[PDB]
Amino acid sequence: RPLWLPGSTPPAHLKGDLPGDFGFDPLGLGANAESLKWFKESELVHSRWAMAAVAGILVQEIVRPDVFWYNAGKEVESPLGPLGLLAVEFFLMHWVEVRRWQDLRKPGSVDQDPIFSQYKLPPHEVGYPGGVFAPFIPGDLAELKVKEIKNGRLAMLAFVGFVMAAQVTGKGPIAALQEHLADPWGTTIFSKAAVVPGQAVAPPCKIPASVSYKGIEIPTPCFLQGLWP
Amino acid sequence: VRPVWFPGNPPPAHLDGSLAGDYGFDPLFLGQEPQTLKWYVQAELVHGRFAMLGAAGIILTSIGAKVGLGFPEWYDAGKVVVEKNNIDFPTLMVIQFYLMGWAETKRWYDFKNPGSQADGSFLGFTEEFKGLENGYPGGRFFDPMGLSRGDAAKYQEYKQKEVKNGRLAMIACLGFAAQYAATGKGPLDNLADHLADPNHVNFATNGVSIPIA
Amino acid sequence: MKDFTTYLSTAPVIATIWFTFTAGLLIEINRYFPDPLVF
Amino acid sequence: DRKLWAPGVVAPEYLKGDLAGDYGWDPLGLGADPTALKWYRQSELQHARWAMLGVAGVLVQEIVKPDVYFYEAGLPQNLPEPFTNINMGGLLAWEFILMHWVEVRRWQDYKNFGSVNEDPIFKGNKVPNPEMGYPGGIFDPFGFSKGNLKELQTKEIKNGRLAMIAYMAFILQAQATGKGPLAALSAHLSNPFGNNILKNIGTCTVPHSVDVQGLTIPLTCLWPGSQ
């Protein structure tokens, strides 16, 4: 059985039943059954959101290289007002999140379509709706679940790297990759900063502190700039 | 058998190693009585947690002050916050005393009568205020991750880590107060001054700690 | 510690602490409210 | 019985001569704990091999490049072509990643013996690893372990201890005279009564700090000599 540390003993609460189980829990956060049940859904939702976000950022830079993703919320103008879009998103997200939360706390209780009584999701597990949500499932379910959780973890780390690279270099993912490929020995984080007992140098925050959006002055500070190496 | 504070001396009879961070340190026998010892355990836990929060906040603000972020020192942050923002000091004092009074009074009456706050008289909540042990209030509110209701050995290890980190943070807060009273600068400023020249920039050369120096 | 608290509960120690508290309260009242003659 | 580290001394109970190069020397009793003894044996082997590599590197470098000081060879301006004036950040990144991987593998082997012998990518590629700190296989392609491994291990630990003492000698000689081991030996051979530890001591030739490209690295001697 593959593990995050070959030759180590996995935790007792991690028996390898859940997909993506590699015996990684040094803090013992998943020891409780209810906590593990909640964290499983949290990881699945985080995985899917990060996967969609990373794919969207890459496609955004490929299709629109002149638009920075970090500035995408500012330099995008639509006939629909920002407050109207926020209201639409709030209502739709509230509806779907309440339905998902109710399915989590009460399994097999919101599988029925409230509009049409002839549509109902078949019995499933928490975090894996299926039915109308899965019109095509090519391959084994367990193998695909492992692939999904692994791709989701990679995408989560990728989004964190996207944010950090955008705050340190001020460029997109493809732009940062090209900049690093041009001079690999002088573009890493080690080449940009270093800390010693006599001096502590950190890279400057390329993101401006304030952003003017229709006369509102939205503050945009780099994530934990003081703790930057 | 267990390591004590002063090696070779037997630990006191009222300290049998059951509590977290037990090293038999009680030369004045302050916690000789059982009820007094229980009260002192809760006092030490509260002191350690408050000192841990204070030390972390002081270190973070000093880090932001050392780099060009505009953060103020810990001994001037209160004045800077009250003057920069239109915040009335007595109003903030009253609000904090109200919230702290409610939380501390509930904790106090739970210490006097264990599990008495679980009756549901506070908005219907019952299991969230039952309390696991003295000074260790488990539940879904204080422990949302459930690290105290799973892997008992890990829970005991975390208890030892918490009490030791709290004692270290208390010593750190005392060091912050003494360093500001002697040098007059921030804690990270003292750390940088010491790292620049450790043989001549210390408490033995500040001119305040050793008066005969 | 029990014997020490019992010793502190004796009449002279209790009288000393109580009179020190009462005297301190009266002194602080006269300090923050100097020369009080009438209500 | 084996010869101890001193005439008339008594070896400790835990030092029965099982390990190579055992002289019953433990004045601090640090080997009383078996787990601590195993960890210290691994640490001694690592120090021995690294010190042997360092001594050989310093000697070969002084022979091939006598115009380059080994103490200041770490500076980017003293690096050979085409690594001269290279960015030290990328170099540190390369070393950190590679050394971190190999050291984590070695550490896991120490924690769980015989659990990381197989290659994680190409299955079937394993190392025999008869004892801790002696992997073999790909690490010994010439096959010198199929013989008297005890005497060879004794030779290895003794040469490593000698190299540890020699490397510290090189460091103090460079910090007190400002030259390499061969240069110090030649200087002492020129006038033994004029160039020795009687006069070279008390002077620290190492500067206070050095500005490596952008950041400054503080430096110091092992003893409080005159800068």
UniProtKB/Swiss-Prot annotation, chain C:
Record's GO cellular component terms: chloroplast thylakoid membrane; photosystem I
Gene Ontology terms: biological process: photosynthesis
Topology versus the membrane: Single-pass membrane protein
HAMAP family in alphabetical order: PSI_PsaJ (MF_00522)
Family: Belongs to the PsaJ family.
Function statement: May help in the organization of the PsaE and PsaF subunits.
Descriptive protein name: Photosystem I reaction center subunit IX
